[PDB]
Amino acid sequence: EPLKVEKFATANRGNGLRAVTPLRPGELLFRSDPLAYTVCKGSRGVVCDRCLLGKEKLMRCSQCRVAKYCSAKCQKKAWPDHKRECKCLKSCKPRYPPDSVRLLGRVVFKLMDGAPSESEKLYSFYDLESNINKLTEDRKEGLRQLVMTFQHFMREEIQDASQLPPAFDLFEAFAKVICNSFTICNAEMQEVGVGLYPSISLLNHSCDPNCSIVFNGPHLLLRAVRDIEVGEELTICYLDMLMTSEERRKQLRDQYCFECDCFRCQTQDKDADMLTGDEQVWKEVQESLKKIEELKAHWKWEQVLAMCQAIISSNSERLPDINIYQLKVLDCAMDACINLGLLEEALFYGTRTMEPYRIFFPGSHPVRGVQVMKVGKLQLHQGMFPQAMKNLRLAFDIMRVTHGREHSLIEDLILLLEECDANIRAS
Ligand SMILES: C[C@H]1CC(=O)Nc2cc(C(=O)NCCC3CC3)ccc2N1C(=O)N1C[C@H]2C[C@H]2C1
Ligand SMILES: C[S@@+](CC[C@H](N)C(=O)[O-])C[C@H]1O[C@@H](n2cnc3c(N)ncnc32)[C@H](O)[C@@H]1O
Ligand SMILES: [Zn+2]
Ligand SMILES: [Zn+2]
Ligand SMILES: [Zn+2]
Incomplete structure (x- = not known):
């Protein structure tokens, strides 16, 4: 098309994204590679730094021995965006930075050395919300420590303001990272990385959203999961669904600096x-x-x-x-x-988990799709064909909306449905 989504100024939650055209469930609204991303602390040396896929044998970078890759292709393709951090990770061994500090290092190298990033088409790192006027003194102290950590980590490559973008402020940059970081999960929905996706960062939060995000390695797909009208704001749920309204209140305050008065929070929907x-x-x-x-x-x-x-x-x-x-x-x-x-x-x-997941992931949610697929796959390989087929079809009904043909896991599910249906055809 032209785009299906546009930036606008909301009445009380800053900038957001709204539908340009009516949208149907499963419609691909936007896709993005990250401005910057990294493997998370626990997945370091378990998944490939570049493609975020797992493997029994990973090969490390010889210079820093921190970065690890699935293949020569991944190690070589990662080099441009690893070159400067490599000198820092080596220099500072055996101190490993927090994920936010490595992430922000990659942001600074991308903005200093890279061409303008497609990830910033709708909204840039410069534009991101920082919530600086709502930060508590406790938060500001923690941001100060991140700044000093970044300065320590990065000293081989970044000594002063000349090596940061114009008028770049590291405190503000960390404040932006806190409330704009995306958690990257693998196909099995296990956290493996963190990234910045500035265009996608326009999306405001709902405890009962009309869109979803999924990841295929570092690549992010934004899809509609309900009917959406022209001009209607697009929303995702920033949080784990398995949280009470009190737990949601604490994280949305602490991390995002806002109070939610949605129906679910007003009514403690499902908390009992x-x-x-x-x-x-x-x-x-x-x-x-x-x-x-x-x-x-x-x-x-x-x-x-x-x-x-x-x-x-x-x-x-x-x-x-x-x-x-x-x-x-x-x-x-x-x-x-x-x-x-x-x-x-x-x-x-x-x-x-199937009946609780049906209740706590209403409509089409990628986590319930994947969970149902896993159960159906276990049933298929144990020879439970009617039970498997029912679950694989249900997974497909969900995942066709949440993942779509652009996500490789849907190809895997299509093969399971085919195998299951051959078994019922022979029965
Ligand atoms: C739905 C799934 C989709 C995924 O792959 N990642 C994922 C990302 C977020 C997220 O980034 N929230 C913040 C948005 C920023 C401010 C715009 C939130 C939830 C995520 N998911 C997830 O189930 N989580 C995250 C982590 C395993 C735990 C539970
Ligand atoms: C990832 S950004 C979303 C885009 C942001 N509104 C902007 O102007 O750039 C996250 C921040 O948006 C705001 N926000 C998101 N969802 C909100 C909501 N439901 N109510 C109020 N503010 C919200 C908060 O400032 C939050 O920290
Ligand atoms: Zn790889
Ligand atoms: Zn290296
Ligand atoms: Zn709410």
Whole structure:
């Protein structure tokens, strides 16, 4: 087309994006590569720095030995955007910067040395919201420490303002990174990276959004997940869906500097179901999930499983599977079992998540699509063809909207549907 989306000034949430034309569910609205991105702390040396895909053997950069790649192609193609950070990562070994500092280093090299980035077509890094006039004194102290970390990390390549863009202010730049960073998940919906996508950063938040984002490696696809009218604002949910209105309030304040008065937040929509079961038990499970989630972020599946089994099959009191902390534990146990080849056990945990996921991911949401695909795949390979086909079709109905033909995972699902339908054809 011309574009289906445009920048505008909203009445009370800054700049946003609105529909130029009526939009239908599954319609591709925009796509972008990042201005800058990096692998997250826990996936470092587990996934390729460039394509964010995993592999038993990664090859490191010989100069810094921090960057690791899946292939010669990826190591070579990454070199231009790695060249300057390489000198810094080496210089500062064995100190590894926070992900926000590595990210901002890549922003500064891209803006100093690169051609104008296609990622900034609708909105640039310069234009991003910083919320500087709402930052608490505590936040400002933490930004000051990031600035001093960046100055330390980058000293080999950046000694003064001459090597930053004109009137670039590192404090403001970090403030922009906090409230504009995208979390990059792999095809299995595991966090692997963080990136800046300035055009896409126009999207304001809704706890019941009309669009979704998905990632195919570092590439971001924005799709409609509802009917949208001409002039209607486009929204995504910035947060994990498995959060109460109080948890959403805390993160939207702390990270985004705004108060949400949507219907869901006004009515604590779903919070009572999410916290069913005995509070003493779900409080302990919430506490244990800090460690389980840290182990998962480091791809430590045997330790994830052990901790999850101690909860799911506890000798002591148990939670209903609609309890969000129980549900996260089931999720982590399912993924651990898939990665360990414990496929009967995986399917047990995955099937228990299906009804909670139907409730907590209403309409078309990519996380529920992928979860249903995983369960259907487990059923297909265990010879449960009618159960598998039902789940793979449901996954397709969701993923055709959330992922679309432009996402390679849809090709993988199409192959599973074909295999399943050959089996029912022969039956
Ligand atoms: C839906 C899925 C889509 C993905 O791949 N990434 C993802 C990104 C965000 C996000 O970036 N929110 C902030 C937007 C910025 C201010 C514009 C939020 C959620 C994300 N997803 C996700 O399920 N999460 C993120 C992480 C694994 C946990 C849960
Ligand atoms: C990723 S940016 C979105 C674009 C931003 N409004 C701009 O002007 O650049 C995130 C910031 O937008 C604002 N924002 C996003 N969703 C909002 C909402 N539902 N209500 C109020 N402000 C919101 C907050 O300032 C938040 O930190
Ligand atoms: Zn690669
Ligand atoms: Zn290097
Ligand atoms: Zn809300």
